[PDB]
RNA sequence: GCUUGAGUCUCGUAGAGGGGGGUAGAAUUCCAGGUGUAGCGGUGAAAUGCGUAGAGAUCUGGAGGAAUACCGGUGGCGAAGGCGGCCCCCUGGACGAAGACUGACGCUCAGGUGCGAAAGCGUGGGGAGCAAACAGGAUUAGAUACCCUGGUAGUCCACGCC
RNA sequence: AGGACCGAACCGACUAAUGUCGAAAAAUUAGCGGAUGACUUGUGGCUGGGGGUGAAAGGCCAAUCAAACCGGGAGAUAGCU
RNA sequence: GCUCGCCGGAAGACCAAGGGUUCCUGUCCAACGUUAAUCGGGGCAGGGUGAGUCGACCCCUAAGGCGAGGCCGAAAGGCGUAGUCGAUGGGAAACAGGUUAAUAUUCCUGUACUUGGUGUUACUGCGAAGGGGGGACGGAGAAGGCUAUGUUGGCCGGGCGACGGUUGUCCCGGUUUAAGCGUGUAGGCUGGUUUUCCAGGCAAAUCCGGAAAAUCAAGGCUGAGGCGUGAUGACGAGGCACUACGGUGCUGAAGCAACAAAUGCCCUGCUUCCAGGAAAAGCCUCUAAGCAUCAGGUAACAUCAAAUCGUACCCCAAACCGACACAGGUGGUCAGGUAGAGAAUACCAAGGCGCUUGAGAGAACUCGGGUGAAGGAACUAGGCAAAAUGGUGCCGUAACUUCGGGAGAAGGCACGCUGAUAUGUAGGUGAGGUCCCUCGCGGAUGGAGCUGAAAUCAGUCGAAGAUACCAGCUGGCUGCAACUGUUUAUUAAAAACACAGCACUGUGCAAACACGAAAGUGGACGUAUACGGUGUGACGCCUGCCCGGUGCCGGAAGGUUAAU
RNA sequence: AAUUCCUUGUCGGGUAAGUUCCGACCUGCACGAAUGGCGUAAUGAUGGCCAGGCUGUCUCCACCCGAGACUCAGUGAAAU
RNA sequence: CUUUAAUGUUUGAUGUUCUAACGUUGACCCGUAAUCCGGGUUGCGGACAGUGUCUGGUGGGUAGUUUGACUGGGGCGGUC
RNA sequence: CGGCGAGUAGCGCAGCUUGGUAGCGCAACUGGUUUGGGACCAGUGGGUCGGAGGUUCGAAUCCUCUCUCGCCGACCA
């Protein structure tokens, strides 16, 4: 019975990262949809 | 040998391994070795293109000389080898003053013989020569397509292609499929049939021998449910249809050869 | 110890003896084109099948395939089954001729191993003609036949079996 | 030699009881099959929603699958309580 | 603190993943802990992570990813060469003791190793984005040699006993030591070497690959463990000086050999088989463009550095993931004693724990268990469960069969323990002396010493001797599937799926078929003894009959017919 | 027959007792050649059936350890 | 008009030869230290092939829907 | 209890759209051929459409309810 959130912080940074979301077109869309709401949790940087 | 395996247990009950006692039991000759990175079914867009296929045991592809452009240097066949890739096993042949190289073993060769490619060589097992200077009515293989390409025709184990006639600046070739074609007379080819010539009855015997060869299990189309293949679905093994591919084209039927950039060159197609 | 048994050795002679590579002529059924038009094939007589989408006919160019007219003669070989072109390789047996020779080593042989046409079988090559099967057309009181038009297993090669 | 045999680790999960607002949003305690193979697992990549993958059940894609999820269209529309 | 319980291939000890002060000290007990709490993984406050050598960073790649010019794409954007990134792999190097309330291969004591920089000196042909070699490899399977580690004895220190005997064949405790350095062994592969040449490695090449005469049978590379320096040092049972109840400081003997012994090491080694087993840098040698006294590289030596960050604690759990102080799920290394084939199981060591509700009485009922008179499936949808056989060695093994299997068919026979064979044999290992001695870690011989089966008899005890744990129910037919395997992850494990095989059919290469507007890749760096697809599904006996209709595959006479 | 409803078809066998079960009949409502026929050693957490074993599955339950239930003090929910 | 011979002169059909656009997952130097590509030679196909638009065919590979009502429940068979 | 399918001599069928005449193949039977059956070469006898109707210019025909035998469905909880 392995449970679903099976964590790893390198796989959380290659994918949900900053440099994972600043490269393409529709990652930059996400960071612009967040800082219009304007919250401190914009990515996963740490 | 052509050995029959003494059937101890289920899964040795049908195996036969067409094996050579004189294929060398050692190593690939390393300076002709580039690796291969396995790409089962999926192109560079991911996305499984060919079905039916997968992984299995690791290979290290051997660089095989096909053009044979030395044309005038004699060649000592050092040893045979088993390059696992095609079916037709390979023989390391060093030349007179230098480079060592792999060519297709043409079934008549045992190692130590002299061979030579070129327009000015003998008529023997293992000499490659352009079909202007050929004996007519022979039986050859490894035929090129253009004078300089290297070869695309009859290089699988045991096979052969019989030159039938000379059409002036053209040479027509009886292929071992039923169709026969017409190429210009300046293409290059080697006498005789290729080695591993009794690979034809290599029974695998078991699921196990397949799945480390690379073939991967494929399920029948009437087994599936109908959202998965057009034959799919059916309450108790009912076909009721007309046999088509996954994507729609009817098989056991319509001849979908329509390249038309090649229809110039087929003399007599297959009936 | 003997030589007439039987078997050796020495020059040769005739042959479709066996196994293995290739090779040549005639000729059939297809592939391709020209000349060319109502019939072709068929057995007793018909009708299937082929044909005005131009067959059959002939001529020109290829295709493989299998059999090797005539020489062929109760002729030559083989223990038998069976062997029919030529060619080169290997190689087996029968027999004549006179000398040298071992000096009965011979005859037969249930046990046994081996060979053994035809089809029949296994695996992979092969495919003309022909032909089990089978179909239709007649025939027939009925025709699961004899006849007719096509045709599949096989016929054929290597390799095991029988 | 072996998808060989009895059999642990491990992988799986056929059998009956308990649980079934439980110790757990499927597991425990005994018995059970495989167990150098078509093997299990570890980590890092690749695949996309009429599309992905599938030793093919319409099963699996985050406790949801005969077409996942979030936001927008959108107060969709409901003759029906 | 005493006593008793539990685990001991784990609930023990060290780490990655992950978490992020939970670690230690003094205090606080209002919330938090399925109660209390002078307690805590709860709060307050202080305090704790020392590296040239472990890891990361770093030199270099794999799957794979962005991806200059590009080809393509309506915009976005899709693909890709050059390139530059990406360890779960290759590249440099440290071990023993001590010590903190709490960290260590970091610090202090001791012995040292590793790659760079500068330069005195000695030499002097070096130098790629170039070439070559290596690093560079699989699976299985034994067997030989050893180490970890353990066991018995000797030595050495203390003991002889809170009821019988125990001055000796007697009890208990300790008998630790690395990297590195010198000598190179059991062991494996390998012919070295000198001259003269070569159309081979895109050119070049004193390298390497090849071809040829000479020359004697050696040099060399890799190499567990051993043996001494390491170490007249430390460690070391314990006893004493002090006595803050924690303990502090000096001193401190013996430190031996043999029997075993692996799954660890030589082993990236070797036999064998088919399913044919990763690429580049470090390091190594040889050239080009240059400089060619200068400059660069080699060697000895002296001297100077080795930036950065991670480390505290848990890490088979109360701290990671499961809404939680959850019987759940997570991967790798070390592996003790006695019986045991063992990493099964039984009981214990070091070492952690007693699963943060306890105290009574001992109803029905429920759950987990033990035996049960006589009987034996009568119960039931069905022997579901539960019960029972259950172990090595020796025999004795059916129908059928593909000749293998079947079959651990079935079925019975002995097991404890003392002595005798023999003051413990066979077998295993095996010092000195002796002898030749390529003066050795040699090679024969001899065999002390030390372990230790198995097997046969007598005899003796039990009621029962595989005594407990652990630990095969068994055959007689038949349906379906050939068979091991897979599936509804969470009500469906089989007859369903795959399967090796058989077949049809498509495919001649810028293949068909696919994923993409397209470029493109897959197929395949394969080319009809191979690839796609479909069907049925081991091997054995076989594959009847209809070509109508639906639909493909040939044909092009006619009728009909879109665009223009 | 895993297809055959109709039917417990009817006979042999096993039982004192046999809608399942083994062997055939042919009346195949509606088997039958690769939507494959028939057969098949071995194998299967497989589908029925049978004898032997063995036992609390049963006649018929009887006792008996231990965790709950119940009593006391602490703490203290939930469906509706 | 049926039927033939040649001529003038205009389409359309079919084939051979050819090179010059186009094709070239042929070779070969160069940009470039590069199995991408572009550029220039050379060989081979060759007005076909490929694509654009128009167009008949084919088209469950896909997408959007549609599949009455009374009815002594619904379906059936009626009736409308 | 209800659809689709019909009944033409012993046996089995065209006549039925759109009403007008009861034919046809094989049996009983008799004959030609042959020495004789059977077969071939030909004929005679065999019904007023299961039946009762009404309807009407005359009905197997046109319809309706019955006798019987086919066949189709008799389903969901």
Coordinates of N, CA, C and O (backbone and C1' of nucleotides) in Angstrom, one line a residue, chain E residues 277-336:
Chain E
rG277 P 27.4 -7.7 -28.1 O5' 27.5 -6.8 -26.9 C5' 26.3 -6.1 -26.4 C4' 26.0 -6.4 -24.9 C3' 27.2 -6.1 -24.0 O3' 27.2 -4.8 -23.5 C1' 26.4 -8.3 -23.6
rA278 P 28.6 -4.0 -23.2 O5' 28.2 -2.5 -23.1 C5' 27.4 -1.9 -24.1 C4' 27.4 -0.4 -24.1 C3' 28.8 0.4 -24.0 O3' 29.4 0.4 -25.3 C1' 27.2 1.5 -22.7
rA279 P 30.9 0.9 -25.4 O5' 30.8 2.5 -25.6 C5' 30.1 3.1 -26.7 C4' 29.9 4.6 -26.5 C3' 31.3 5.3 -26.4 O3' 31.8 5.6 -27.7 C1' 29.9 5.9 -24.6
rA280 P 33.3 6.1 -27.9 O5' 33.3 7.6 -27.2 C5' 34.5 8.2 -26.8 C4' 34.1 9.4 -25.9 C3' 35.3 10.0 -25.1 O3' 36.1 10.9 -25.9 C1' 33.5 9.6 -23.6
rA281 P 37.6 11.0 -25.7 O5' 37.7 12.3 -24.7 C5' 38.8 12.4 -23.7 C4' 38.2 13.1 -22.5 C3' 39.2 13.1 -21.3 O3' 40.1 14.2 -21.3 C1' 37.1 12.3 -20.6
rG282 P 41.7 13.9 -21.2 O5' 41.9 13.4 -19.7 C5' 41.6 14.2 -18.6 C4' 42.0 13.5 -17.3 C3' 43.4 12.9 -17.2 O3' 44.3 13.9 -16.9 C1' 41.8 11.3 -16.4
rC283 P 45.7 14.0 -17.7 O5' 46.3 12.5 -17.6 C5' 46.7 12.0 -16.3 C4' 47.1 10.5 -16.4 C3' 48.0 10.1 -17.5 O3' 49.4 10.4 -17.2 C1' 46.2 8.6 -17.5
rC284 P 50.4 10.9 -18.4 O5' 50.4 9.7 -19.4 C5' 51.0 8.4 -18.9 C4' 51.0 7.4 -20.1 C3' 51.6 8.0 -21.4 O3' 53.0 8.0 -21.4 C1' 49.7 6.6 -21.8
rU285 P 53.7 9.3 -22.1 O5' 54.0 8.8 -23.6 C5' 54.8 7.7 -23.8 C4' 54.5 7.1 -25.2 C3' 54.7 8.0 -26.4 O3' 56.1 7.9 -26.8 C1' 52.6 6.9 -26.5
rC286 P 56.7 9.2 -27.6 O5' 55.9 9.3 -29.0 C5' 56.2 8.3 -30.0 C4' 55.3 8.6 -31.3 C3' 55.4 10.0 -31.8 O3' 56.5 10.2 -32.7 C1' 53.1 9.2 -31.7
rU287 P 57.0 11.6 -33.1 O5' 56.2 12.0 -34.4 C5' 56.1 13.3 -34.9 C4' 54.9 13.4 -35.8 C3' 54.5 14.9 -36.2 O3' 55.3 15.3 -37.3 C1' 52.6 13.7 -35.5
rA288 P 55.6 16.9 -37.5 O5' 54.2 17.6 -37.8 C5' 53.5 17.2 -39.0 C4' 52.3 18.1 -39.2 C3' 52.5 19.6 -39.1 O3' 53.0 20.1 -40.3 C1' 50.5 18.9 -37.9
rA289 P 54.1 21.3 -40.2 O5' 53.3 22.6 -39.7 C5' 52.3 23.2 -40.6 C4' 51.5 24.2 -39.8 C3' 52.3 25.3 -39.1 O3' 52.8 26.3 -40.0 C1' 50.6 24.5 -37.7
rG290 P 54.2 27.0 -39.7 O5' 54.0 27.8 -38.3 C5' 55.1 28.4 -37.6 C4' 54.8 28.4 -36.1 C3' 56.1 28.7 -35.3 O3' 56.3 30.1 -35.2 C1' 55.0 26.8 -34.5
rC291 P 57.8 30.7 -35.5 O5' 58.6 30.4 -34.2 C5' 58.1 30.9 -32.9 C4' 58.7 30.1 -31.8 C3' 60.2 29.8 -31.8 O3' 61.0 31.0 -31.3 C1' 59.1 27.8 -31.3
rA292 P 62.3 31.4 -32.1 O5' 62.9 30.0 -32.7 C5' 64.1 29.4 -32.2 C4' 63.8 28.0 -31.8 C3' 65.0 27.1 -31.7 O3' 65.7 27.3 -30.4 C1' 63.2 26.0 -32.7
rU293 P 67.2 26.7 -30.2 O5' 67.6 27.0 -28.7 C5' 68.7 26.3 -28.0 C4' 69.5 27.2 -27.2 C3' 68.9 28.0 -26.1 O3' 68.8 27.2 -24.9 C1' 70.3 29.5 -27.4
rC294 P 67.7 27.6 -23.8 O5' 67.0 28.9 -24.2 C5' 67.2 30.2 -23.5 C4' 66.2 31.2 -23.9 C3' 64.7 30.8 -23.5 O3' 64.4 31.1 -22.1 C1' 64.7 31.5 -25.7
rA295 P 63.5 30.1 -21.2 O5' 62.2 29.9 -22.1 C5' 61.3 30.9 -22.4 C4' 60.1 30.4 -23.3 C3' 59.3 29.3 -22.7 O3' 58.3 29.6 -21.8 C1' 60.0 28.9 -25.0
rG296 P 57.8 28.6 -20.7 O5' 56.8 27.6 -21.5 C5' 56.4 26.4 -21.0 C4' 56.1 25.4 -22.1 C3' 56.2 23.9 -21.7 O3' 54.9 23.5 -21.2 C1' 57.6 24.2 -23.6
rG297 P 54.9 22.8 -19.7 O5' 55.3 21.3 -19.8 C5' 54.5 20.3 -20.4 C4' 55.3 19.1 -20.8 C3' 56.0 18.4 -19.6 O3' 55.1 17.5 -19.0 C1' 57.5 18.7 -21.4
rU298 P 55.5 17.0 -17.5 O5' 56.8 16.1 -17.6 C5' 56.7 14.8 -18.3 C4' 58.1 14.1 -18.2 C3' 58.7 13.9 -16.8 O3' 58.1 12.7 -16.2 C1' 60.4 14.8 -18.2
rA299 P 57.8 12.7 -14.6 O5' 59.3 12.7 -14.0 C5' 60.2 11.5 -14.0 C4' 61.5 11.9 -13.5 C3' 61.6 12.4 -12.1 O3' 61.5 11.4 -11.0 C1' 63.1 13.7 -13.5
rA300 P 61.0 11.9 -9.6 O5' 62.3 12.6 -8.9 C5' 63.5 11.8 -8.6 C4' 64.5 12.7 -8.0 C3' 64.2 13.6 -6.8 O3' 64.2 12.9 -5.6 C1' 65.4 14.9 -8.4
rC301 P 63.2 13.2 -4.4 O5' 63.5 14.7 -4.0 C5' 64.9 15.0 -3.5 C4' 65.1 16.5 -3.4 C3' 64.0 17.3 -2.6 O3' 64.3 17.2 -1.2 C1' 64.5 18.4 -4.6
rA302 P 63.2 17.6 -0.1 O5' 63.1 19.2 -0.2 C5' 64.1 20.1 0.3 C4' 63.8 21.5 0.0 C3' 62.5 22.1 0.5 O3' 62.5 22.4 1.8 C1' 62.9 22.7 -1.8
rU303 P 61.2 22.4 2.7 O5' 60.3 23.5 2.1 C5' 60.7 24.9 2.1 C4' 59.8 25.7 1.2 C3' 58.3 25.7 1.4 O3' 57.9 26.6 2.4 C1' 58.8 25.4 -0.9
rC304 P 56.5 26.4 3.2 O5' 55.4 26.8 2.2 C5' 55.3 28.2 1.7 C4' 54.2 28.4 0.7 C3' 52.8 27.8 1.1 O3' 52.1 28.7 2.0 C1' 53.3 27.2 -1.1
rA305 P 50.8 28.3 2.7 O5' 49.7 28.1 1.5 C5' 48.5 27.5 1.6 C4' 47.8 27.4 0.3 C3' 46.5 26.5 0.2 O3' 45.4 27.3 0.6 C1' 47.9 26.0 -1.6
rA306 P 44.1 26.7 1.4 O5' 43.6 25.5 0.4 C5' 42.8 25.9 -0.8 C4' 42.5 24.6 -1.6 C3' 41.9 23.5 -0.7 O3' 40.4 23.6 -0.6 C1' 43.7 22.6 -2.0
rA307 P 39.7 24.6 0.4 O5' 39.4 25.9 -0.5 C5' 39.8 27.3 -0.1 C4' 38.9 28.3 -0.8 C3' 37.4 28.2 -0.6 O3' 37.0 29.0 0.6 C1' 37.9 28.3 -2.9
rU308 P 35.9 28.3 1.6 O5' 34.7 28.1 0.6 C5' 33.9 29.2 0.0 C4' 32.7 28.6 -0.6 C3' 31.8 27.7 0.3 O3' 31.0 28.6 1.1 C1' 32.2 26.6 -1.7
rC309 P 30.7 28.2 2.6 O5' 29.5 27.2 2.6 C5' 28.3 27.5 1.9 C4' 27.7 26.2 1.4 C3' 27.3 25.2 2.4 O3' 26.1 25.5 3.0 C1' 28.4 24.1 0.6
rG310 P 25.7 24.9 4.5 O5' 25.5 23.3 4.3 C5' 24.4 22.8 3.6 C4' 24.5 21.3 3.4 C3' 24.7 20.5 4.6 O3' 23.4 20.2 5.3 C1' 26.1 19.7 2.9
rU311 P 23.4 20.1 6.9 O5' 24.4 18.9 7.3 C5' 24.1 17.6 7.0 C4' 25.0 16.6 7.7 C3' 25.1 16.6 9.2 O3' 25.3 15.3 9.7 C1' 27.2 17.1 8.3
rA312 P 24.2 14.6 10.5 O5' 24.1 15.5 11.9 C5' 25.2 15.7 12.7 C4' 24.8 16.6 13.9 C3' 23.6 16.1 14.7 O3' 24.1 15.2 15.7 C1' 23.3 18.4 14.2
rC313 P 23.7 13.6 15.5 O5' 22.1 13.7 15.6 C5' 21.3 13.7 16.8 C4' 19.9 13.5 16.6 C3' 19.5 12.3 15.8 O3' 19.4 11.1 16.6 C1' 18.3 14.2 14.9
rC314 P 19.6 9.6 15.9 O5' 18.2 9.4 15.1 C5' 17.0 9.2 15.9 C4' 15.8 9.2 15.0 C3' 15.8 8.2 13.8 O3' 15.4 6.9 14.2 C1' 15.1 10.3 13.0
rC315 P 16.2 5.6 13.8 O5' 16.1 5.5 12.2 C5' 14.8 5.6 11.6 C4' 15.0 6.0 10.2 C3' 15.8 5.1 9.3 O3' 15.1 4.0 8.8 C1' 16.2 7.4 8.8
rC316 P 15.3 2.5 9.4 O5' 14.0 1.7 8.9 C5' 12.7 2.2 9.0 C4' 11.7 1.1 9.4 C3' 12.1 0.2 10.6 O3' 11.0 -0.2 11.4 C1' 11.8 -1.1 8.7
rA317 P 10.9 0.2 12.9 O5' 10.7 1.8 13.0 C5' 11.1 2.6 14.1 C4' 10.3 3.9 14.2 C3' 8.8 3.8 14.2 O3' 8.2 4.7 15.0 C1' 9.5 5.1 12.3
rA318 P 7.8 4.3 16.5 O5' 6.7 5.4 17.0 C5' 5.5 5.6 16.2 C4' 5.3 7.0 15.9 C3' 6.5 7.7 15.2 O3' 6.1 8.7 14.2 C1' 5.9 8.8 17.2
rA319 P 7.1 9.0 13.0 O5' 7.7 10.5 13.4 C5' 6.9 11.6 13.3 C4' 7.7 12.8 12.7 C3' 8.5 12.5 11.4 O3' 8.6 13.6 10.6 C1' 10.0 12.9 13.2
rC320 P 7.7 13.8 9.3 O5' 8.5 12.9 8.2 C5' 9.4 13.6 7.3 C4' 9.4 12.9 5.9 C3' 8.0 12.5 5.4 O3' 7.4 13.6 4.6 C1' 9.4 10.6 5.3
rC321 P 5.8 13.9 4.7 O5' 5.2 12.8 3.9 C5' 5.3 12.8 2.4 C4' 4.6 11.5 1.9 C3' 3.1 11.3 2.4 O3' 2.2 12.1 1.6 C1' 4.3 9.3 2.5
rG322 P 0.8 12.6 2.3 O5' 0.0 11.2 2.4 C5' -1.1 11.1 3.4 C4' -1.5 9.6 3.5 C3' -2.5 9.3 4.7 O3' -3.8 9.5 4.3 C1' -0.7 7.7 4.6
rA323 P -5.0 9.7 5.5 O5' -4.6 11.1 6.2 C5' -4.3 12.3 5.3 C4' -4.8 13.6 6.0 C3' -4.2 13.8 7.4 O3' -2.9 14.5 7.4 C1' -6.6 14.2 7.4
rC324 P -1.7 13.9 8.2 O5' -2.1 14.1 9.7 C5' -1.2 13.6 10.8 C4' -1.9 13.6 12.1 C3' -1.2 13.0 13.3 O3' -1.5 13.7 14.5 C1' -3.3 11.9 13.0
rA325 P -0.3 14.0 15.6 O5' 0.3 12.5 16.0 C5' 1.1 12.4 17.2 C4' 1.9 11.1 17.1 C3' 1.1 9.8 17.3 O3' 1.8 8.8 16.6 C1' 2.6 10.0 19.1
rC326 P 1.1 8.0 15.3 O5' 0.4 6.8 15.9 C5' 0.6 5.5 15.3 C4' -0.7 4.8 14.8 C3' -0.5 3.6 14.0 O3' -1.6 2.7 14.2 C1' -1.7 5.2 12.8
rA327 P -1.3 1.2 14.8 O5' -0.5 0.4 13.7 C5' 0.7 -0.3 13.9 C4' 0.8 -1.7 13.4 C3' 0.4 -1.9 11.9 O3' 1.3 -3.0 11.4 C1' -1.0 -3.3 13.3
rG328 P 2.3 -2.7 10.2 O5' 1.5 -2.0 9.1 C5' 0.4 -2.8 8.4 C4' 0.1 -2.1 7.1 C3' 1.2 -1.8 6.2 O3' 1.6 -2.9 5.3 C1' 0.0 0.2 6.6
rG329 P 3.1 -3.3 5.1 O5' 3.7 -2.3 4.0 C5' 3.1 -2.4 2.6 C4' 3.5 -1.2 1.8 C3' 5.0 -0.8 1.7 O3' 5.6 -1.6 0.7 C1' 3.8 1.1 2.4
rU330 P 7.2 -1.8 0.8 O5' 7.8 -0.3 1.0 C5' 7.8 0.6 -0.2 C4' 9.1 1.3 -0.2 C3' 10.3 0.5 0.2 O3' 10.7 -0.4 -0.9 C1' 10.4 2.6 1.3
rG331 P 11.3 -1.8 -0.6 O5' 12.8 -1.7 -1.0 C5' 13.2 -1.3 -2.3 C4' 14.6 -0.6 -2.3 C3' 15.7 -1.2 -1.5 O3' 16.2 -2.4 -2.2 C1' 15.8 1.1 -1.1
rG332 P 17.0 -3.6 -1.3 O5' 18.4 -2.9 -1.1 C5' 19.3 -2.5 -2.2 C4' 20.6 -1.9 -1.7 C3' 21.3 -2.6 -0.5 O3' 22.0 -3.8 -0.9 C1' 21.3 -0.3 -0.1
rU333 P 22.2 -4.9 0.2 O5' 23.5 -4.4 1.1 C5' 24.8 -4.2 0.4 C4' 25.8 -3.6 1.4 C3' 26.1 -4.4 2.7 O3' 27.0 -5.4 2.5 C1' 25.7 -2.1 3.3
rC334 P 27.0 -6.8 3.4 O5' 27.4 -6.2 4.9 C5' 28.8 -5.7 5.2 C4' 28.9 -5.6 6.7 C3' 28.6 -6.9 7.5 O3' 29.8 -7.8 7.5 C1' 27.6 -5.0 8.5
rA335 P 29.6 -9.3 7.0 O5' 28.7 -10.0 8.2 C5' 29.2 -10.0 9.5 C4' 28.1 -10.3 10.5 C3' 27.4 -11.7 10.3 O3' 28.2 -12.7 10.8 C1' 25.8 -10.0 10.5
rG336 P 27.5 -14.0 11.5 O5' 27.5 -13.6 13.1 C5' 28.7 -13.1 13.7 C4' 28.7 -13.4 15.2 C3' 28.3 -14.8 15.6 O3' 29.4 -15.7 15.4 C1' 27.3 -13.2 17.0

